[PDB]
Amino acid sequence: GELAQSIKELAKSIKELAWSIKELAQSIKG
Amino acid sequence: GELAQSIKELAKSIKELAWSIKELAQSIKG
Amino acid sequence: GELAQSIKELAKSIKELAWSIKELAQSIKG
Amino acid sequence: GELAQSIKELAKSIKELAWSIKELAQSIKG
Amino acid sequence: GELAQSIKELAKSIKELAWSIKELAQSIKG
Amino acid sequence: GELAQSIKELAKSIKELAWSIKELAQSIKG
């Protein structure tokens, strides 16, 4: 149901956060 | 129920954080 | 119940910290 | 149950991450 | 079922976020 | 069975997340 649906949305948001953190790590090196 | 609603709010707030981290990275780069 | 209320409060804090990070990124740019 | 308690623990860690990113941005702004 | 499947993807996304944060920490320390 | 193993993988990923955020704080402060 909607519990599982909401957890899939949360997982997708966490993947987007992990990508932004990789971008920040690269920008710190220049 | 309200648990599923709170998880969806958390997912939207994490997406907001990911976008702000992407902007921070570009500012350090430029 | 209690756990869903807590998750919603934490989501709001994360959202507000995201807004603050974006403001800092904006002034690092100039 | 345990599922909601784990989501709450995750949200606490994400909030702590956002505070660390803010302090990183502040140190770079100087 | 769907609930187990959604929690799998959630756990794997959190593992990827943890790895990205370690990469950030190492970039910051230099 | 499969849901039970979901939960346990989620719990381990959240401990790894917590450890990585401690590393991030130490690198910022150093």
Residue numbers in the entry:
A (entry chain D), B (entry chain E), C (entry chain F), D (entry chain A), E (entry chain C), F (entry chain B): 1 to 30
Task: Share the article's original sentences.
CCs are quaternary structures comprising two or more α-helices supercoiled around each other with cyclic (Cn) or dihedral (Dn) symmetry. Peptides are named systematically appending the one-letter code for the amino acids at the a and d sites to “CC-Type2-“; e.g., CC-Hept becomes CC-Type2-LI.
Not all of the peptides with e = g = Ala were soluble, therefore, some were made with g = Ser or Glu, and suffixes “-Sg” or “-Eg” are added to the systematic names. By contrast, those of the βL class and peptide CC-Type2-LL showed weak or non-specific binding of DPH. The latter makes an incomplete slipped barrel of five helices with a sixth helix packed against these to fill the void completely and consolidate a hydrophobic core; i.e., screw symmetry is broken in this structure. Nonetheless, both had extensive KIH interfaces linking all helices and, as such, are CC-based structures. CC-Type2-IL-Sg only had identity symmetry element (E) due to a Type-3 interfaced helix docking into a slipped barrel architecture, Fig. 4a. βL class peptides adopt slipped barrel-like or collapsed structures depending on the amino acid at g.
